[PDB]
Ligand binder design. Structure first.
Ligand SMILES: [K+]
Ligand SMILES: [K+]
Ligand SMILES: [K+]
Ligand SMILES: [K+]
Ligand SMILES: [K+]
Ligand SMILES: [K+]
Ligand SMILES: [K+]
Ligand SMILES: [K+]
Ligand SMILES: [K+]
Ligand SMILES: [K+]
Ligand SMILES: [K+]
Ligand SMILES: [K+]
Ligand SMILES: [K+]
Ligand SMILES: [K+]
Ligand SMILES: [K+]
Ligand SMILES: [K+]
Ligand SMILES: [K+]
Ligand SMILES: [K+]
Ligand SMILES: [K+]
Ligand SMILES: [K+]
Ligand SMILES: [K+]
Ligand SMILES: [K+]
Ligand SMILES: [K+]
Ligand SMILES: [K+]
Ligand SMILES: [K+]
Ligand SMILES: [Mg+2]
Ligand SMILES: [Mg+2]
Ligand SMILES: [Mg+2]
Ligand SMILES: [Mg+2]
Ligand SMILES: [Mg+2]
Ligand SMILES: [Mg+2]
Ligand SMILES: [Mg+2]
Ligand SMILES: [Mg+2]
Ligand SMILES: [Mg+2]
Ligand SMILES: [Mg+2]
Ligand SMILES: [Mg+2]
Ligand SMILES: [Mg+2]
Ligand SMILES: [Mg+2]
Ligand SMILES: [Mg+2]
Ligand SMILES: [Mg+2]
Ligand SMILES: [Mg+2]
Ligand SMILES: [Mg+2]
Ligand SMILES: [Mg+2]
Ligand SMILES: [Mg+2]
Ligand SMILES: [Mg+2]
Ligand SMILES: [Mg+2]
Ligand SMILES: [Mg+2]
Ligand SMILES: [Mg+2]
Ligand SMILES: [Mg+2]
Ligand SMILES: [Mg+2]
Ligand SMILES: [Mg+2]
Ligand SMILES: [Mg+2]
Lengths: 59, 101, 91, 61
RNA sequence: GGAGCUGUAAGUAAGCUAUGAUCCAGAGAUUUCCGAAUGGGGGAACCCAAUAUCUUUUAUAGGAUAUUACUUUUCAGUGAAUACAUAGCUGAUUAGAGGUAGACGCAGAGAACUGAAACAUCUUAGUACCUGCAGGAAGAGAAAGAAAAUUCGAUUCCCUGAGUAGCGGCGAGCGAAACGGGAAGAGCCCAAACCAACAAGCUUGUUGGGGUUGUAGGACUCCGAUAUGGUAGUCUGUUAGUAUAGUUGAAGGAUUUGGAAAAUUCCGCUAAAGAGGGUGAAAGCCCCGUAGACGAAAUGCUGACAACACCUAGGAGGAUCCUGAGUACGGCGGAACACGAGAAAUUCCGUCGGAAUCCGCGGGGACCAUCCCGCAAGGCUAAAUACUCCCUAGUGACCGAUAGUGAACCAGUACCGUGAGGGAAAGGUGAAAAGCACCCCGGAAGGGGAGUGAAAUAGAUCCUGAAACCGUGUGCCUACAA
RNA sequence: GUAUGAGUAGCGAAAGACAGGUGAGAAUCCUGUCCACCGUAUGACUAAGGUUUCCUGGGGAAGGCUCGUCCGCCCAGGGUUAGUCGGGACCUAAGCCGAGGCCGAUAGGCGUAGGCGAUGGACAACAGGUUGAUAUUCCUGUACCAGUUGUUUUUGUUUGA
RNA sequence: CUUCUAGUGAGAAAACAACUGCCCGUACCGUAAACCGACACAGGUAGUCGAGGAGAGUAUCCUAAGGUGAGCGAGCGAACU
């Protein structure tokens, strides 16, 4: 969440962004197949990346 | 709306006048509310709804919020609602008795 | 753009499944991605080695629901052929 | 534009009046001349009206 | 703000939410590509680059980031014919391009149909259109004025003068202004003379001081004052208010009809609230509101306060000096003044000629004299005035679906045209989908039952359901009639 | 909006026949057989143009001048694979744009350098196979063009390849 | 594109091995029912290939490859056109 993002460091935030991007890629593949159940997780991950990028820019 | 989910309300207009029940669902945008056992409708349902008969189901339909009044939990009677801040928290108050909620 | 954003999703159809038997996989890719970028993205994402990459532009398809008619989004389709001695992509 | 570099004179529209007072639009032009003059210390050919030159204060390099 | 929420838009599916979501307001971040589009190109939303850094690969290929249009200002460097230089070229710097609101303003250019019962002067009309420039307003504005009551004292706009004075193939028509009454009100800066500084080439350019006028002013020379007042200045602060969300906000139960009460009847109650809207029919007391009270973290806007900033002198003498030149004015040709060359002032443009300067100059409708009024050829200036694409809150003896915007509805859409362009039709089930389970005929469509509903001849071509038109049934008549 | 004409004109150049099948339903859809038509075309390729009309599976509301079980229609999925083919990262014609510039009430007109612009010039791969739908594009086989890294063998290092 | 020097130059060339090579189009109709003619319209639509007998021939008749039976029919066999 936003509080945790602010706690993290610059390098930590960048690594978290990469991890979330990979997870979003995996979710896209699972949704393309029938292997995804929690569809809302995609929007959650996208908004999480948005929060991380917003914090990065406001630093 | 002045009435809220889970409230005990009295119907003051309609075929179900003077009945009392708990609020099951609230729709502020429509200014409507559903009270258990109030305004029940027979609905001709095809069996496509996981019920392998379809049948004639019975369900409560919403009624306009203005047609109900919150039941005083302390007195058990319907009353109008004022708003008083109690101990720094805004709450509903019965105009007939002054009890909260 | 980011490599992880280059590839959007796989394509599962009869033609794509036959491609897989020949060890080639069909992906929908960003419409601005060229086959060289697609090759780089596939290698990074899947650890495989890419032998070749073919790419097509799928035109928007006209559709209509009731009284409203429009076009499906244009797409870019890439068939990626992996070399021998390469891990298969798992879906 | 074909405008006096100093006095700002420029082409304008007038009337042709016959003895019957019939009116038709005409163009009335100033008497401009291409003259080599010093602007900010450098020579240049610019349009200048004979009226502007009349005083003699405009250098004639 | 306090309980639901993931739009229209149901449905499934998956989720969020008192750890305060959705939602509302202020601020901020991201904001692909085209488009003035501006690295170059281009058939807009596409293509291809150079330079520098970074990234993928063993490496080429590949990717990301930043800069790179043209012109204007300024500076600097380089630098031709040519010696000096300039011009060019390079870099940096500076501010412009484009769109609007089909409105309002100023200016350039500028019709015809039409009227004259024809038509050319004239009128339509300096209108329509095109173009440039703008500002929130613009334009005008501080007398070379209006007058001749003796006076007034910048401009603008309104009423009036007045359809008058006048203009006009003296036709058709066009048509003032001053006085008077009002809205609003505000006055100020330079050029010049003179002094000082600076540089060059005693004057001759820059800077500063000085001066801004007609009951003539200023310089200059004497004196005396170094005040008194003001501002049309500032992202200067403080303060108050206000705009952009909101909070609170009185008082009704029964009775009869009805599917349903607000309607009827009976008794009540509130009102700083009996505006309005919704609710199963018509509600002061059911809901949203209204009167009233209250409220702003954040950003705007306004007014005040202070701060800073900037303007602000009195009296006396003229010997001399200054007071806007190719200007005023005149000829010629046009144009604007209500005024069409007319006796023609006044003002403007083009061309040519061309003054005086305080014993001076301009105007007072040709012109001269006297008298009176004013002081051009430099600039700025708020308010009263004009308009509304927009946003907010309202109003209507304004329209109510062939009306009202073309468009109440996915309308400048469908459709038409190569293109500019032209341009529609189309609102209403029910209180509530309770949108007809199930059965029967049928392949379906569509019906008949059975149900929902107060009502289904309210069944989605759905409120009402007219006429034309079509059809069924029949009380009377009709196959010797024009 | 609905009549009248009126159940009238018309149903747009030509050969179909029968058997079987499907289907609620068949002159009209499918299969078969014979017959007939075009064959410098009514065949096979392609440019432009159209823009999914292509393939598969469903459907018979509307459209098809009849019918329709069918379709270039409707519904749902799917389909276009390039270093070598055409175009761009190559060149230019006509024409067009046009830095400065010339000209001009405004707007703008013209035009140099420089560019754009093919219908032309230059340019490396062909045969076969494969799918329901793509193929000098995928696959098989065998090539060619441009270039990078490496190994080796050669040869030049400033009278310098 | 091939040469010439000017310039530039410490690395070039050959063989071999391995490897790299971007963007747009690619469906389908295309002397037509899919384009231009409002139509599934007797019209128009550039270029290529376009066979055999007789034949000068791409004429003409009948055929090959290949394509097609034309999106209303069944009767009757009057006038009239
Ligand atoms: K452009
Ligand atoms: K407007
Ligand atoms: K006329
Ligand atoms: K007339
Ligand atoms: K002004
Ligand atoms: K009048
Ligand atoms: K007359
Ligand atoms: K002064
Ligand atoms: K109610
Ligand atoms: K009411
Ligand atoms: K404030
Ligand atoms: K005159
Ligand atoms: K005067
Ligand atoms: K009804
Ligand atoms: K009858
Ligand atoms: K008719
Ligand atoms: K008829
Ligand atoms: K079918
Ligand atoms: K060509
Ligand atoms: K193809
Ligand atoms: K022969
Ligand atoms: K022949
Ligand atoms: K047929
Ligand atoms: K007959
Ligand atoms: K006949
Ligand atoms: Mg391709
Ligand atoms: Mg560009
Ligand atoms: Mg006339
Ligand atoms: Mg402005
Ligand atoms: Mg209240
Ligand atoms: Mg009452
Ligand atoms: Mg006049
Ligand atoms: Mg003159
Ligand atoms: Mg005069
Ligand atoms: Mg007089
Ligand atoms: Mg006087
Ligand atoms: Mg003003
Ligand atoms: Mg009506
Ligand atoms: Mg209308
Ligand atoms: Mg009825
Ligand atoms: Mg009706
Ligand atoms: Mg008889
Ligand atoms: Mg009889
Ligand atoms: Mg007849
Ligand atoms: Mg036919
Ligand atoms: Mg022939
Ligand atoms: Mg087909
Ligand atoms: Mg089919
Ligand atoms: Mg039919
Ligand atoms: Mg040109
Ligand atoms: Mg094919
Ligand atoms: Mg093809």
């Amino acid at each position: 969440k936003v509080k945790e993002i602010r706690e993290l460091t610059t390098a930590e935030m960048l690594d978290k962004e990469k991890q979330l991007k990979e997870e979003l890629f995996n979710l896209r593949f699972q949704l393309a197949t029938g292997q995804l159940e929690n569809t809302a997780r995609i929007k959650e991950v996208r908004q999480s990346i948005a929060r991380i990028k917003t914090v990065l820019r406001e630093q | 709306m002045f009435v809220k989910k889970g409230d005990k309300v009295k119907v003051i207009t309609g075929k179900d006048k003077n009945k009392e029940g708990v609020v099951l669902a609230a729709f502020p945008k429509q200014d409507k509310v559903i009270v258990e056992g109030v305004n029940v409708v027979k609905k001709h349902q095809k069996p496509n709804q996981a019920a392998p008969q379809g049948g004639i189901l019975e369900v409560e339909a919403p009624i306009h919020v203005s047609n109900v009044m919150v039941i005083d939990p302390s007195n058990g009677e319907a009353t109008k609602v004022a708003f008083k801040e109690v101990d720094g928290k805004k709450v509903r108050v019965s105009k007939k008795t002054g009890e909260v909620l | 753009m980011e490599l992880l954003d280059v590839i959007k999703r796989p394509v599962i159809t009869e033609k794509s499944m036959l491609a897989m038997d020949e060890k080639k996989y069909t992906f929908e890719v960003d419409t601005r991605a060229n086959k060289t970028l697609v090759k780089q993205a596939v290698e990074s994402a899947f650890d495989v080695k890419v032998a070749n990459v073919n790419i097509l532009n799928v035109r928007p398809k006209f559709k209509r629901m009731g009284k409203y008619a429009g076009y499906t989004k244009k797409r870019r389709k890439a068939i990626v052929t992996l070399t021998e001695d390469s891990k298969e992509i798992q879906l | 534009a074909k405008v006096c570099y100093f006095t700002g004179r420029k082409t304008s529209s007038g009337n042709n009046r016959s003895h019957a007072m019939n009116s038709t639009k005409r163009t009335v032009k100033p008497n401009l001349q291409k003259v080599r003059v010093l602007i900010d210390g450098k020579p240049k050919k610019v349009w200048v009206s004979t009226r502007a030159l009349k005083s003699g204060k405009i250098e004639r390099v």
